[PDB]
Ligand binder design. Structure first.
Ligand SMILES: Cc1cc(C#N)cnc1C(=O)Nc1ccc(F)c([C@]2(C)Cc3c(ccnc3F)C(N)=N2)c1
Length: 378
């Protein structure tokens, strides 16, 4: 408890391509880099030589492999993957010293799933069984891990933004944060669902029915880059961000993520952009707390741009039909504790978050907020 030096810095990535941990499948162990995804619940790995893959699960080489003789087909709005279900021995080299028998979807066909140039070959769904495919009887990896060993039912994520980070499995590491952890209830165990009760752009409230903020869902998701916001809320949100920053002009496409915006190197006017604050439901009736992110978090360097030589960024707040998504834009500001045992998520200021000399990411409380139960959709 309190320090897990083995697990510090166990995450790698490329800006915009996600955070991956090293894992091993089968006996003898096959090493794979695996995307850490709190927005899904399947452990799914490449199992065939797709050209984009550095490597893939070779079931034939594993003595400990077992067929479940059952397929799984998983469509997304952007592409898909299809696989064959089995179980095998799984471990995490830079995690706890255990080996568990977990479900594995051996991916045999896919579209727009693997990324050309990426260095991961699978995905670790860390959310709950309810949203597992094909259904909730397929036990997620973390459930298997907790049932089969003495690892405490919790994990924490420090996403640092070559990006890096830590996934502390079974605990919390106090070197990864400063100040205090503040906790928000997990509303329901399917996604990591939470409730936003108030939004401030630059200290100024948006004065929307808070029900909208969570229409139809608000989730914490390490498998999404953006802060995604319901359309009605996104509309009001950028209306206010536009106004805060009208000191300089940008095409209406930029706010829609249809175009990048560039400045001369080291010339980004961060200060013309407002801090963003979400107030989250607290542990106590009528008590909330507030997390504050910087434009550093929502204006994202796009490095791979050959038509330019400047500092070009993407506005990483975007509209959504599935609810608020608190992606890497949010998580990079904070140490995030997925306290599954107590059905809550903790936020603290990350020791690694990107901050200039004038503004810093913040987690503050307590605040008095009435009628927070009304902010959740039914
Ligand atoms: C591009 C990327 C950037 C960051 C950063 N920084 C983190 N993750 C990814 C990424 O490539 N995730 C990903 C890829 C394929 C998937 F199939 C999913 C799913 C399973 C499906 C998914 C998700 C989110 C949004 N719509 C989806 F279709 C999600 N959380 N999980 C996520």
């Amino acid at each position: 408890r309190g320090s897990f030096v083995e697990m510090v810095d166990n995450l790698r990535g490329k800006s915009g391509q996600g955070y991956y941990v090293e894992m091993t499948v089968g006996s003898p162990p096959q090493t794979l880099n695996i995307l850490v995804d709190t927005g899904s619940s399947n452990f799914a790995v490449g199992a065939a030589p797709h050209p984009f893959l550095h490597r893939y699960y070779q079931r034939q080489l594993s003595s400990t492999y077992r067929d479940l003789r059952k397929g799984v087909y998983v469509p997304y709005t952007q592409g898909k993957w299809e696989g064959e279900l089995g179980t095998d021995l799984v471990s995490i080299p830079h995690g706890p010293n255990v080996t568990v028998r977990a479900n594995i979807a051996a991916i045999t066909e896919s579209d727009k799933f693997f990324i050309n140039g990426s260095n991961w070959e699978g995905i670790l769904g860390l959310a709950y069984a309810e949203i597992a495919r094909p259904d909730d009887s397929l036990e997620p990896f973390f459930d298997s891990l907790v049932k089969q060993t003495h690892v405490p039912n919790l994990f924490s994520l420090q996403l640092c933004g070559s990006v890096g980070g830590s996934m502390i499995i079974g605990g919390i590491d106090h070197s990864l944060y400063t100040g205090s952890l503040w906790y928000t209830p997990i509303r329901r165990e399917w996604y990591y669902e939470v409730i936003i009760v108030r939004v401030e752009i630059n200290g100024q409230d948006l004065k929307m029915d808070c029900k909208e903020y969570n229409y139809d869902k608000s989730i914490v998701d390490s498998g999404t880059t953006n802060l995604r916001l319901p359309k009605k809320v996104f509309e009001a949100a950028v209306k206010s961000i536009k106004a805060a920053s009208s000191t300089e002009k940008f095409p209406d496409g930029f706010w829609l993520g249809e175009q990048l915006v560039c400045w001369q190197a080291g010339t980004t006017p961060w200060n013309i952009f407002p801090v963003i604050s979400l107030y989250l439901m607290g542990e106590v009736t009528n008590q909330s707390f507030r997390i504050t992110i910087l434009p550093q978090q929502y204006l994202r360097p796009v490095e791979d741009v050959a038509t330019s030589q400047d500092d070009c960024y993407k506005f990483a707040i975007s509209q959504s039909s599935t609810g608020t998504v608190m992606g890497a834009v949010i998580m990079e500001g904070f140490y995030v504790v997925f306290d599954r045992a107590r059905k809550r998520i903790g936020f603290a200021v990350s020791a690694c978050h990107v901050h200039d000399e004038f503004r810093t990411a913040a987690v503050e409380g307590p605040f008095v907020t009435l009628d927070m139960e009304d902010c959740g959709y039914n």
